[PDB]
Amino acid sequence: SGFRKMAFPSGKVEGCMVQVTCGTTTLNGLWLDDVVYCPRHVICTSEDMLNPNYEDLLIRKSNHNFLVQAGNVQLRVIGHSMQNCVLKLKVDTANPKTPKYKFVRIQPGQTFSVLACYNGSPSGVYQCAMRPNFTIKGSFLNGSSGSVGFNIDYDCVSFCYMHHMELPTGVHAGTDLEGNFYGPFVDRQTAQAAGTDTTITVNVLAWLYAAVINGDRWFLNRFTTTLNDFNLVAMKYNYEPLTQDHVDILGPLSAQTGIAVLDMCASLKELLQNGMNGRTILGSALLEDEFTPFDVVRQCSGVTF
Amino acid sequence: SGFRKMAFPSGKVEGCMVQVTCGTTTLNGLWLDDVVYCPRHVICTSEDMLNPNYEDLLIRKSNHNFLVQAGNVQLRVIGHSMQNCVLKLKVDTANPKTPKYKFVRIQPGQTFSVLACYNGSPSGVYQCAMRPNFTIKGSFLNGSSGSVGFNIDYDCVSFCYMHHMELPTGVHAGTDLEGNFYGPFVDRQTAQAAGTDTTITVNVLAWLYAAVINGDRWFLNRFTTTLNDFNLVAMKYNYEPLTQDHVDILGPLSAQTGIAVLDMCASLKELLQNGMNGRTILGSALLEDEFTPFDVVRQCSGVTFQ
């Protein structure tokens, strides 16, 4: 019993984190076999970040310009190649602790654990979500760019994110490990801003299902909605559309509790209209939206890796 | 910027986790060097549990009665002793991933990371506080006993909690890694019940400070209070007494932000009396009490000018 914001076991990712210096600029890198990925903005300095020519700055740079450290040990860079917004430094040594991995691009509303690093040194792990506006509300200080977010999908670490920059609102943008940014953001100091954030409806419903599983029934009601009308109400509370796809990934939880998804949408309809009125669900006074359906299943079945 | 419930990385602990089976009971062990620590209730059938005598049950066991597994690989048990409520199984191999480590008993209010495991494999990691009534509000299912809490100081893992059992209220009870229970709890099947739970007052303040550090100020005020007039209002809202030991650890956060502890205590007093009034602090509608001052410094602190 109980329900917590649970992070993935960060073990198999801690072995992959390294330091990458270039000038006086230090950030973090991900070491997988004989390649070290990091933000291409390690090459820039403070002037260049105002308006960078990455293709002309990587020219005036050679292998010896990149210092790469793995604990006490040093690593020898035997090539480079900037793909999109991420650097891939070929190095002479394969990481012994390289796990079975893949590179994924996640859709908004999908969650992942973030391993916050400084100086190639993991400091903490937390569970995050890709906001609808393609940011994440992370916890990052100066020098954490290159820290990575990930899932464990069965036996295989799925790298989904690499931190680049902090936007002015306090939120955070980055790339997949192919270097292609999430959202409209770009690696340069300009007047970028995040959109307005909205709530990830399908995750809220997942969490209401968790609450039912763990014994909370008060928010349930005989009322009934259609998919269309729910979205009309929800939309005025900054809730993301619930699609027919969404209604399917909720079908497992629908059948474990015998509550149709549309009946749960009616429960959520009334919580939006009437509020919560100083009541808690699963130790919470707000509607949590950072647990996916699969996150619920995992915590409630005791899924291991 | 930002502020999350941040767990310590769990790798150093992942490499220690093993599966311990005895009879029909399977649970988790901790493989440090050539010893496996696990809860001693693994040797009980549920008929003994009703009123067991543990040194009597342990002297009936053979080494071969313990199935210990690390991955596919069975470990050979060569000895078995008790220390309070934990079994030390001597195995024949030393754990090659054994981190630098140490066993520490924590106090109520302090926090730690928990690696929830089943069958010696980890399910995930989360931060917890030792509640003042010596329970924890974990997420633990059947098979989770043997899971451990831990803090990490540099390279060094300070194991502080081992999970044993779930109480009727759905909170969790366990021991330090020397076998002594946190709280008045016993590993036999009796009526047991958690004492009254209260809010860790020092921790809330640490979190109001973390809020001010992240640019929330809406809940501050010019009002100031005596420590005693606070506790008078606080106690009636189910809060722990605040005391100089607490004030003197907030000191750095009170200094980094410029807000005298006694002023932060007048902010909280007003939050208690008037409620939050449809507002949020660090994305929360409740006052959070599972962040210690140290978890705040850990997470959102930098260079200070002298």
Author numbering:
A (entry chain B): 1 to 305
B (entry chain A): 1 to 306
Question: Could you share sentences copied from the article?
Answer:
In addition to its essential role in viral polyprotein processing, the SARS-CoV-2 3C-like protease (3CLpro) can cleave human immune signaling proteins, like NF-κB Essential Modulator (NEMO) and deregulate the host immune response. Functionally, 3CLpro recognizes a hydrophobic substrate residue at P2 (usually Phe or Leu), a Gln at P1, and Ser, Val, Asn, or Ala residues at P1’. NEMO is necessary for activating NF-κB during the canonical NF-κB response signaling pathway, which is a critical first response to viral infection.
Within the asymmetric unit, the C-terminal tail (Ser301-Gln306) of chain A inserts into the substrate-binding site of chain D. Additionally, the substrate-binding site of chain A is bound by the C-terminal tail of chain D from a neighboring symmetry equivalent dimer. This C-terminal tail-binding contributes to crystal lattice formation by connecting chains A and D to each other throughout the crystal. Our C145S construct terminates at the P1 position (Gln306) and so lacks the residues corresponding to P1’ to P3’. Thr26 and Thr190 form H-bonds with Ala233 (P2’) and Ala228 (P4) of the hNEMO peptide, respectively. This causes the distance between the Cɑ atoms of Thr26 and Thr190 to decrease.
